[PDB]
Structure 1
């Protein structure tokens, strides 16, 4: 047993709040916001040694990142941003920072009851995305 045991699994989106505004703040254009906002992704989290993999799969896009905590990596996001990302564990929360074009967004993933809660923040705009086990 280890670092991320309670995150591992297959998770499905069950609720979203303020996601459109988050995507506007990030710079996502109209058509992508509409199609991406309709998606109902599954998030699949696995661990092998020190390497964590997070997949997002939906009718919009399928994405996958693999990383070591605290070790920066280049990421192409589902909306096609080229970002430099770093993911750390801070008090049991996975904290994922993306930097690009002098901008920054922070995405927190936490276990709360039987849910995996994803909080997406950019400047003053937050979106909360709630996932349950598949």
Structure 2
């Protein structure tokens, strides 16, 4: 159905801003922030039918989620939070909401020019992570 076509592919992190602050807001501890903040993950997005898969490979952690839009799932984040996640498409933006311990964070993923821009928001803190095709 060509849902998410423009996201599919292999992407490499090329810039980050305010990610340490976003991680602090989320509750990540010092040593994990330092190691995760160094990483330059490879994000691999694919679609098979209604199922979207987002994999991240890095020297820190490798992660993988598979999901159907609008349908809540279990996720273990790279910092080992056990969260309940729902991912939707809103106006061509992938919106990923994570709920845990009465907290919430939202991760938005959008295509902008030849980049895939990832915006991570926790309370008033935003981190912007820019990916290019690998």
Bin of the TM-score, shorter chain as denominator length: over 0.9
- CA distance, structure 1, for counterparts of residue 91 and residue 33 of structure 2: 32
- CA distance, structure 2, for counterparts of residue 76 and residue 113 of structure 1: 31
Deviations 1:51-100 (A, max 9, x none): 00000110000000000000000100000000000000000000000000
- CA distance, structure 2, for counterparts of residue 27 and residue 57 of structure 1: 22
SS of aligned partner of 2:5: coil
Aligned to 2:69: 69
How much does 1:130 deviate? Answer: 0.1
How much does 1:113 deviate? Answer: 0.1
TM-score by length of 2: 0.99
How much does 1:8 deviate? Answer: 0.1
- CA distance, structure 2, for counterparts of residue 3 and residue 89 of structure 1: 9
- CA distance, structure 2, for counterparts of residue 36 and residue 99 of structure 1: 21
SS of aligned partner of 1:22: helix
How much does 1:3 deviate? Answer: 1.1
SS of aligned partner of 1:6: helix
- CA distance, structure 2, for counterparts of residue 39 and residue 101 of structure 1: 27
How much does 1:2 deviate? Answer: 1.1
Moved segments of 4+, more than 4 Å: none
Aligned length: 134
Aligned to 1:123: 123
TM-score by length of 1: 0.99
